[PDB]
Design a protein around this nucleic acid. Structure first.
Length: 375
RNA sequence: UUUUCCUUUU
């Protein structure tokens, strides 16, 4: 960082690998524009960006929601003669899945094979995840068979990903065979394995069992993470045990686990659904003061709670404040307000919010169309 | 030096 500038002012000409690490750090901080600037500066200095340089920027653009730009960057390396490698393909395949473009991801999966690149464990893990999320467990499980055929050994992320896919599909007991199957293979379960299973137990109404697995996990030596506690906080809220959810929130602190924005969003959502708007809004104040910045989910959640209560002025006030503070509204924000307005019979307010959403380039969905008190 | 798993909002 500054230490880099100091190094540079001693006349030391740093390796590309040094530049890459830096561009990587910037990307993962949210400082993407600074990353692209340093990209442009290495080029101006005659320092050639390599395949890792490109792979790093393609990922950060994808993670920033800029799949088009990452796509242009991919075209640019190919034009330069800088060959996309297995990581380039894995990275774009992941971005395409996360973006709803499974079909194009699977086209890249065929393209890499045509260039003599072998799909590897990450290639398979990413498509198995992308298929499971798309409702396609069966194809995911066929991809799981196929990797064993190519000689590629299912690892801990492969088992975790599949167990997540099975739990979301109702295949809870099946996930649990897989869990014993990975131990039988010498793959050690992580916190992620337990958290996944704990979530599936909660969603299936087995909070009893989910807490028993939480106890066993701590017993097997596995220290809970913030996700462990978020998942159990959510399940207690969804169950109607908000008091116990607040106890767990106290507890995680006692045990050294730092709450974060999802911890707040979750408690705020369960207080909202309970009708305890009072406490939700206070908890919202608490997170700012403690330095945890509310994200879009935080506003959406509070806006939802206020709309359902018929407190439209208060809900619009949080929308205004969110739009003020640089927090960008999404499809869920506008669906929530239109929903709220339609419910109240304020149909032209809602139609005028529909137009404004398009005005910001946010893509509507059936939800947006479906919602009409017209009928 | 870069890519893949789990929790929250309509």
């Amino acid at each position: 960082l500054e230490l880099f500038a100091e190094l540079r002012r001693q006349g030391v000409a740093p390796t590309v690998v040094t530049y890459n690490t830096l561009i990587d750090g910037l990307c993962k901080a949210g400082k993407l524009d600074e990353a692209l600037k340093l990209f442009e500066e290495m080029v101006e200095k005659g320092i050639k960006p390599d395949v890792v340089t490109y792979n790093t920027l393609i990922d950060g653009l994808c993670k920033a929601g800029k799949l088009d730009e990452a796509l242009k960057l991919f075209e640019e390396m190919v034009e330069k003669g800088i060959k996309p490698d297995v990581v380039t393909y894995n990275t774009l395949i992941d971005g395409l899945c996360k973006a709803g473009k499974l079909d194009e991801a699977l086209k890249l999966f065929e393209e890499m094979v045509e260039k003599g690149i072998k799909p590897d464990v990450v290639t398979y893990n990413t498509l198995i995840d992308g298929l499971c999320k798309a409702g396609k467990l069966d194809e995911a499980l066929k991809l799981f068979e196929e990797m064993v055929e190519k000689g590629i050994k299912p690892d801990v992320v492969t088992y975790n990903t599949l167990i997540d896919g099975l739990c979301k599909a109702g295949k809870l007991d099946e996930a649990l065979k897989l869990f014993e199957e990975m131990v039988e293979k010498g793959i050690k379960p992580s916190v992620v394995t337990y958290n996944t299973l704990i979530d599936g137990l909660c969603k299936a109404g087995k909070l009893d069992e989910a807490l028993k697995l939480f106890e066993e996990m701590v017993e097997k030596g596995i220290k809970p993470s913030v996700v462990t506690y978020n998942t159990l906080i959510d399940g207690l809220c969804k169950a109607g045990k908000l008091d116990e959810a607040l106890k767990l929130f106290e507890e995680m602190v006692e045990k050294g686990i730092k709450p974060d924005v999802v911890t707040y969003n979750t408690l705020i959502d369960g207080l909202c659904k309970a009708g305890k708007l009072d406490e939700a809004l206070k908890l919202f104040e608490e997170m700012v003061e403690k330095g945890i910045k509310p994200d879009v989910v935080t506003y959406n959640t509070l806006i939802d709670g206020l709309c359902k209560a018929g407190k439209l002025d208060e809900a619009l006030k949080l929308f205004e404040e969110m739009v003020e503070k640089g927090i960008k509204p999404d499809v869920v924000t506008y669906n929530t307000l239109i929903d709220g307005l339609c419910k109240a019979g304020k149909l032209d307010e809602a139609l005028k919010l529909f137009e404004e959403m398009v005005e910001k380039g946010i893509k509507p969905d059936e939800l947006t169309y479906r919602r009409v008190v017209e009928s």
